[PDB]
Amino acid sequence: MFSQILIIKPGTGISPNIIISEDIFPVLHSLFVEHDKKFGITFPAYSFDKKGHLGNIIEVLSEDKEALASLCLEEHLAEVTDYVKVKKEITFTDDYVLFKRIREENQYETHIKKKNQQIFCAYIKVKSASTGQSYNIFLAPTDIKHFSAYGLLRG
RNA sequence: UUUAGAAGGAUUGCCGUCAGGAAAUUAGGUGCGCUUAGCAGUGUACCGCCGGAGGCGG
């Protein structure tokens, strides 16, 4: 349980939500899968529920040191060096808080409205390789201490 | 402890006949609208899945 903090620079024109979506999360999927070892993702300053402001900070949860060095963050999320930062230290942070995946129900055509706008207050968008259908994944923050392919804790 | 305390206004009905408003006109001179700007906010949520209702996968 040490760490590596990747930062989403502000300004830059493009919104940080889009930057999070496109660049980061594909590379992460891949990274996580081949490794398979269930990791996790630290979204510090994850502000409010009315909000959903994921923030400008990304940290990766790992177990061993070679545990996070397992992933070559730098060199991967590298080409994009003007919209994402890669810090260069592995810190053994202990005040971390884990993050969980809620869901929210499908549509009436696919009480629907009751579940709607209860979780709809993060909504990261991922395009699927096989089914070819883009969708939203919702997040949460929780007490569980000691996950899945997406970096979120398994259901 | 109030110029106190009390109270059935009722029934009925044919407004009507006629008519010329009408003639004249000059509204006119002048004029500085105008300096700034990201349609953003995320631009919207897909197929399933068992169950049978209720709950996770990509």
Find residue A136's DSSP bridge partners: A125
Find residue A7's DSSP bridge partners: A57, A85
Identity of residue A152: L
Identity of residue A139: L
A110 touches strand B (CB under 7 A): yes
Distance CA A26, CA A30 (A): 6
Sequential DSSP letters for chain A: --EEEEE--S-SSS-HHHHIIIIIHHHHHHHHHHH-S--EEE--S---TTT----SEEEEE-SSHHHHTTS--TTTTTS--SS-EE--------S--EEE-------S---HHHHTTTS----EEE--SSS---EEE--EEE------TTSSPP-
A134 touches strand B (CB under 7 A): yes
Burial of A80 (0-12, 13-18, 19+ CB in 10 A): middle
A106 touches strand B (CB under 7 A): yes
- Please, which experimental method was used? cryo-EM
Nucleotides of B under 7 A from a protein CB: 38, 40-49, 54-58
A133 touches strand B (CB under 7 A): yes
Closest nucleotide to the alpha carbon of A53, via C1': B42
Distance CA A15, CA A4 (A): 23
- Nearest of A55, A49, A47, A64 to residue A5 by alpha carbon: A55
Identity of residue A71: L
A117 touches strand B (CB under 7 A): no
Closest nucleotide to the alpha carbon of A129, via C1': B58
